[PDB]
Design an enzyme around this catalytic site. Structure first.
Site, PDB file in Angstrom:
ATOM      1  CG  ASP A 147      -0.141  -0.461   2.613  1.00 49.75           C
ATOM      2  OD1 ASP A 147       0.789  -0.745   2.688  1.00 49.75           O
ATOM      3  OD2 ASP A 147      -0.774   0.665   3.349  1.00 49.75           O
ATOM      4  CD  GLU A 149       4.057   1.003   6.801  1.00 52.28           C
ATOM      5  OE1 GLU A 149       3.552   1.305   6.221  1.00 52.28           O
ATOM      6  OE2 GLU A 149       4.558   1.002   7.813  1.00 52.28           O
TER       7      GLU A 149
HETATM    8 ZN   LIG Z   1       6.339   2.558   4.255  1.00 53.77          ZN
HETATM    9 ZN   LIG Z   2       4.457   4.797   5.018  1.00 51.23          ZN
END
Ligand SMILES: [Zn+2]
Ligand SMILES: [Zn+2]
Ligand SMILES: [Zn+2]
Ligand SMILES: [Zn+2]
Ligand SMILES: [Zn+2]
EC number: 3.5.1.16
Lengths: 381, 380
Positions: free
Chosen positions: A80, A142
């Site tokens: 992501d 993340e």
């Molecule tokens: Zn990262």
């Molecule tokens: Zn980041």
């Protein structure tokens, strides 16, 4: 199927949107990005497993494996990116553009480039000839929750010798960082006209009492804990946002405070939750039911890679650089539950999440070399 | 891109390179050398081909990559023995697979080793090696060892270690005895048997020399020992004797053919001086009458020290401990440059035999051995 050249791999990854967001309208599936990686790894002869990540908006993890047996190397990254502000970008965020020794695009630095580098380094490697396993993990979300990494760590049976997470560190090896917990404290008061303040419960007054306790916790954290290896040696606690009440002439009927804490490695989440609850206890007990705490994202502990690991020895020698620590947070605490882990990758944190994000071309050759060399050392020996 | 393993092997087997002392059966190894040289150039090596002085148009090849000190030498011979065409059942020069065996002259001894080196190197990037790698291909191992002798006399190379890929069933060999074979020749002086005093009887002189030589035999058996060898001492053999024309004539000449197989550690000069010392009472009593001529080029004994790192590495890779053997190789000459093992695929039991073969079971472990020793001694 032959792997495209490095720049084409990079270009396709950048061109495949994979923004994560709390808000559903901005939260894009990483299905397309994941499948792109998965089939490239399949083409190089890896076994590839793609799994839905429970509780996410249609997000997936990928684990590519070659070999069976104990140990080996895990190379890990997230798929992501953060969103972009189209007011501030001056180029198409999805169009990888080279200019003045830089490669611009959303996720060039953070951190899609790392996957291009892995694939390009594996271009010719015959994985049948490896002596210990090589694993590549590509995670979901993340930048928001870390649900991908958390889910992998909770479920995987793998126990590699060691792991590298390719976040942007300017190819400096990072061995530790602080945790991150972010909470909203919510207080419900009672309405009433300001001509008779005693008649209601004033949420700002209660929040004042709460902030007193929270700032005493901030002081105690700072007095008690220090790791001068960190540029900010203490656990930090930040009051970020506050909002409550309708009007000057009405008792404030509600108030919300958003805050964060960044604990040092070694403090458990359970510990810290206890310290926050203890801090707020005098208020919650005086005003039962009126104070609630919500998490703004799932909490993340700090981490530190142990000393005397081959991984460090090898990487420090390969880079001519000693390990460093950082104050910000990564998926490392989750991966470190599986094996000794470093954070090490091309590009700079200075470009992460920024308009006109880029990765400097000077990282290309040294990154390709590092990856080839760690595979050789950890998988071919 | 090199051709696949089987095609390299086929090409080498198909290129006759029989060596022989007879001029009529002694084939040039130029064509065999050319195949190897061109393939090593294809792989990016620097390649030198040198004529071997005193041979019938034979060559040595040295392929080299890298600069500076040390590194690894892989060595083999390019010649084969002749074949007995009444005893073979396929064409000797046609590599043929049957029931897990690859048949052909030089499959086991030892063309296969070069095919395995080339095949192991096919994807290896030599520009990345940190220490040099050398491949030697010699002439005339099966006759004079002229190739190895000349290389060892002339090269300035000093590798860290070497392997010679003779067929040992991939069991490391670290020593063997030498071999010297001499004709002791005595010139007598003829005359009628009715008057012995008027001549010089070569059989009588030879009898005196034999006594001295058997004393040397006894000395060698008593005073030099190497427990690992099946016969743990230097041997001496009296093989042939011939002299004189008739019972009624003083024997005018006599010749004795003998051999000695010395242990590792005895030099040829030391052995030559023992023999010369033994014969001295005779040559001094009869100046000009006794000569010693070699019947073949002498070969010293050889060993590599058992605790060398090359022994440790190969013993672990192969799961086989080092052995010693009684027959000769080029190892004594290469051991002058660096510690040297004899180690290669195929069996000694197929060497020089009709319908020689190398089993295909050797392919994967030989490729892995070569890859691992290149890595160990050259990569970092
Ligand atoms: Zn990262
Ligand atoms: Zn980041
Ligand atoms: Zn290595
Ligand atoms: Zn041979
Ligand atoms: Zn032979």
């Amino acid at each position: 199927n032959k792997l495209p050249p490095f720049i084409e791999i990079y270009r396709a990854l950048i061109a495949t949107p994979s923004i994560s967001a709390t808000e559903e309208a901005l939260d894009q599936s990483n299905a397309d990005l994941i499948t792109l990686l998965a089939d490239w790894f399949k083409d190089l002869g890896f076994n590839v497993e793609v799994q839905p990540v429970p509780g996410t908006r249609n997000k997936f993890n990928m684990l590519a494996s070659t070999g069976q047996g104990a140990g080996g190397l895990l190379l890990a990254g997230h798929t992501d990116t953060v969103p972009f502000d189209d007011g501030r970008w001056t180029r198409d965020p999805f169009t990888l553009t080279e200019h003045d020794g830089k490669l611009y695009g959303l996720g060039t630095a953070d951190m899609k480039g790392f996957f291009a580098f892995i694939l390009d380094a594996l271009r010719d490697v015959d994985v049948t000839k490896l002596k210990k396993p090589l694993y590549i993990l590509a995670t979901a979300d993340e930048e928001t929750s870390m649900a991908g990494a958390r889910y992998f760590a909770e479920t995987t049976a793998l126990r590699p010798d060691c792991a590298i997470i390719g976040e942007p560190t300017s190819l400096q090896p990072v061995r530790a960082h602080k945790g991150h917990i972010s909470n909203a404290i919510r207080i419900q008061g009672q309405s009433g006209h300001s001509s008779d303040p005693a008649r209601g419960v004033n949420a700002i007054e209660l929040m004042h009492d709460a902030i007193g306790h929270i700032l005493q916790l901030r002081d105690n954290l700072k007095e008690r804990y220090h790791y001068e290896a960190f540029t900010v040696p203490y656990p930090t606690l930040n009051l970020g946002h506050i909002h409550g009440g309708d009007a000057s002439n009405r008792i404030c009927a509600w108030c919300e405070l958003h805050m964060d804490i960044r604990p040092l490695p070694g403090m458990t989440l359970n510990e810290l939750n206890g310290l926050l609850n203890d801090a707020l206890a005098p208020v919650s007990e005086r005003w039962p039911g009126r104070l609630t705490v919500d998490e703004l994202h799932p909490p993340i502990p700090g981490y530190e890679c142990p000393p005397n690991h081959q991984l460090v020895e090898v990487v420090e020698k390969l880079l001519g650089a000693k390990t460093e620590v950082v104050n910000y947070c990564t998926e490392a605490p989750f991966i470190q539950t599986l094996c000794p882990t470093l954070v090490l990758g091309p590009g700079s944190i200075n470009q992460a999440h920024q308009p006109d994000e880029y990765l400097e071309t000077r990282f290309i050759k040294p990154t390709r070399e590092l990856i080839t060399q760690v595979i050789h050392h950890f998988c071919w020996h």
